[PDB]
Every structure is written in structure tokens, then in C-alpha cells.
Amino acid sequence: GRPSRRAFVTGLTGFTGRYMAERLQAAGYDVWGTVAPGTPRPADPAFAQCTLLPVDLLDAEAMRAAAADARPDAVVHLAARAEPSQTYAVNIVGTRNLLAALSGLDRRPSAVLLASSANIYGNSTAGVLDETVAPAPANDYAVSKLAMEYAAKLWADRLPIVIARPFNYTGVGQSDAYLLPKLVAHYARNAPRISLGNLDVSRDFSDVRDVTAAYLKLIEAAPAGETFNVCSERAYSLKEVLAMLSRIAGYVIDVTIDPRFVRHNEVKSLSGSRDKLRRAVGELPVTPLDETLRWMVDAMRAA
Template sequence: MKRVLVTGVKGFTGRYVAAELAAHGWEVWGTGAHEAVGDARYRRADLVDAASLRRVVEEVRPDAVVHLAALAFVGHGDADAFYRVNLIGTRNLLSVLAPAEQPPECVLLASSANVYGNANEGVLRESTPPSPANDYAVSKLAMENMARLWMDRLPIVIARPFNYTGVGQADSFLLPKIVAHFQRRAEVIELGNLDVSRDFSDVRAVASAYRRLLEVCPVGETVNVCSGRTHSLREALAMAEAITGQSMRVEVNPAFVRANEVRRLGGDPAKLRKLIGEWDSPPLEETLRWMLEGASV
């Protein structure tokens, strides 16, 4: 049984990735910034503390690493924290893995499709020039560029996930916010532009893609993880109304509307499928139904 170390294992994505890996025969160990009681394979380790990371790597001796730990919410108020965690924290991890007595056979780094920004209308491919539009996206692109300095010493693969959702995601994100409003039978919801379309995947499908990328390990590649289908918030609302039989009044809050926001941003999953084989994400309606039913992880 191969041993994998998942950073951010207790986070939204981490829980699904850990379950996916365990279901396919991996011995899963994890790290996070907080204490967790009752998990023998979890270790507290802060990305900004290289010494704590070194202790974990020396103990676990992972055959592979999935690096998910990051500051992810774009609206987070502390811009400096994006760089401390996403850039410097990732560098700390790579600096510990590279000289390890037993270096990992694959290191999967989760970046973000936010690096493409909002300037490129239509279908985004890995060859689309990055144009990050906020500190979170800049920190992720900087992380990618920094990681390339380590590719002669570590077998690194970079994943760029587009939007994805599922049970357990915080309702500071748009689709969980919509779901939460329907679950409590709210009469009104405040949103931004209802007619911008984005590429949404199911977190379970993303976890599967990460596991398969880890097993194939196309070293040095950067890969979009996306469904290839786009939906607007208006369409997502209509799906939720059809599933629940409820209706909800929408009030557009100007504070949520971004100036010059492009109408459609979607990803091209062709490279992902070429690397890992047949793969798809469930239809968004199926994911919303799962979320609305409130199933557990």
C-alpha cells in the first residue's frame, strides 16, 4: 500500500480527496493548521513553519503528496496572507520534500483557474495566457512559477481546477449560498450578475481527477480540471427551484457586481482526459440535488 500525504486534509476538498485515495488503496496521511482529535494519521503542521513540515515528512515518508492547503476565499481581507500561505508555504513544502531521504514519486500542486483572470472570454485552455485579477490569483500564479524552479528535483504536476462545489463547501461560495437559502426556505436572496456563466464541477469528480493525475503523474505538466460546460447563476437558481418546488425572489446587490465582468468563462478538459483517460463531472443539476438533500460527506 502506497502512502500519500495530503496537506489541508480536513478542508472541503481534502476530505473528498482523502476518501477517494483511501477507496483506491492508498494509505492516507494528512496535515492541517489545527488540532484534530482521534485521527492517528493526521499531523498538525503550518505551511509557514518549515520545521513542522520537515518533522511530518520525516515521519510519514510519503510516496506521493497532494498539496491542497491554501488560503482560498478570494474575498479574504488580508492580502499578505495569500502570499505567506500560497506562495511561501508551498515553497517551504517543496524545500522539505526535495532533500528527503525518500523523495516522493509524485507531487500534485493544486493551483486555480483564477490565474486566467476575467479578461479571456470563452473556452480557456492551458495555453491561454494568465491574467490574474486579484491577490489570490496572483499568489497562485506565483506559486506555479516558483514550483518550476523545483522541477529538476521533484516530480511536480500542477492542477488548475475551475469552480467546483459539493456538500460541505462554505456558503461564502455562490452555489452553497444558493443551496443554504433554499434549505432554510428563504424568501429572498442577494446576488450579483445572474447572467455570467461559469464552469462548475462536482467536488467528487475533482477528487477523482486528482487521484488519477497522481497515479499517472505527468511530470512538469499543468492541467485544467473542469467540466467543459458552463451555467449561469440564473440557470442554477432555476435548477434549485425545480428540485425543491420552491421559488425565491432575487435582489441584485450592486456590491456583488464586478465591473467589466466577462459573460462566459469555461475550461477545456481535453488535456486532462488525454492524460488520465475517460473522465467527466456529473451534471450540475445532479450535484445541486445532492447538496440540497444535505447528504453527508
């Protein structure tokens, strides 16, 4: 029947949440999660066996009641924003509301995984970043994620808290507000041209399926008090990505360099080390980016 062991995922119906749900369900959890009040129900079949609770993160009391009902053994906090003020409120106080709700439970969860971001490192010149690299967040969103980490550690005496710092990741279902889905969308409809920044800037990209598999491993190991990069450890330039898509689509898209996308001080190469993660949970398969991209192109064309 319906599994007794429960997971609770904030932002469950977002891009990452859809994949987190499948990972948790396959690991045997009954997956519960939050959705925004007054937004339309999700149509995706991935959520057919999920219990969806309408909760605003800034609604501390509704969060407390949702948690007490859900009674999770595992928590994955994915819900975030991105007005600067709402970004700080949702990412710091919304997270605090979640932790307060869990801390007040009769039975506290065995693992609470918070999704931070590798954006907290900012524009580091260190080439390959591990978790000891000094933060230098370069926008309010990145600052709010870093602040979330510090705010969350205040609850370490009450909850087993694991922090993930994912590098860039993508996959089927991510909006074209992000760069790789934008590229995929253009190639999928055989667009003649696109406008981009510098093509010689290399960054670390992962498949969302790999990222959520890592998240699950962090849940299972529950290393309370520890922060982990989640990344592929491979850096690709936009030129390499374009070349992959050209091979997939069978043509070369024409590129215009827009100054609006060109950052003068941008470091040429920046990637992550997942060595700390590897030592904690062991080796994890890395899906090749060209497989990820083909997956996305195929999904776009099949739509």
C-alpha cells in the first residue's frame, strides 16, 4: 500500500522538484510537498502519487500545520525566489519558517537537505572550487542564498541539516529563462540565429537527474552540519555546447554577440569539485552533457 515513510519537499512541482519526487519515490518514500496557494493544479503525471499542500513559505503558521500533518522523515527544501526585498524574505525567512516548523514536531526528521547555490562563490578566479573557497556572492539572489545557509545553521542543535551548493544544471522542463534551454529551444525549432555573450567562457553543467540522485544520497547519509558542492567537475564553453547541438540538430546556428550578455570581468573558466561529496557518499555516474542536451532537444520536438 501507500508507504509509511514520508518525504516533504518544498517547491515540489517546480523543475527540480519533479525529478526529486521520482528519486524519493523510487527510494520508497511517500512524497508530500508544498505548492503556491491559488495557482492552478499541476497536470504532470509525475505528481499523481504526491500529496500537495498549498502553503506560502512566508506563512509561518500554515508551514507549521503542513509539517505537523506531513510528519516527514526526510525534507528537501527547493522552494526559493529567483523586488530584492522578496528575494531576501522568501530565501531567508521562508527557510527559517520551514526549520521552525520541523523543529516543533514531536518527531524531528532524520535529514533536512537545503538547496543553496554555487552562486554564493560568485566570480572566483580559483578555477576549480571546493567548499573552502571564500564566498563572494555577486547579486542579491546569491547573497540571500548565503544568508540562508547562515540562518539555517542556527537550527543545527535541533535538526540534522545538510546544505547543497549545486552548480549549473538543466534538463527537460527547465524554463528558457535559463541559457541551455534557450539554446535547445532555438535548435529544436531550427532557428537560423541566436544572440549570446562570449563563447569562450567555460562553466560546470549537470543533468538535473544526476543532481537529484546526489540529493537523495545526501538524504540517505544525512551528514548533519556539512555543506557539499554538487557538480559535474567538467567545464564547457558555449562554443562546445553549440558544437554539441549542431551535431544533434544537423546544422550550425548563426551567432550574434550581444553586449547585453557580455560581462567584462567574467572569469574564463570556473568549475566545481565534488570530491567532498564523493568521499561522503561514494562515486556517482555522470550523465554526459551531450546526452542531456539530446534528451532536451528530443523532448522539445516531441511536444
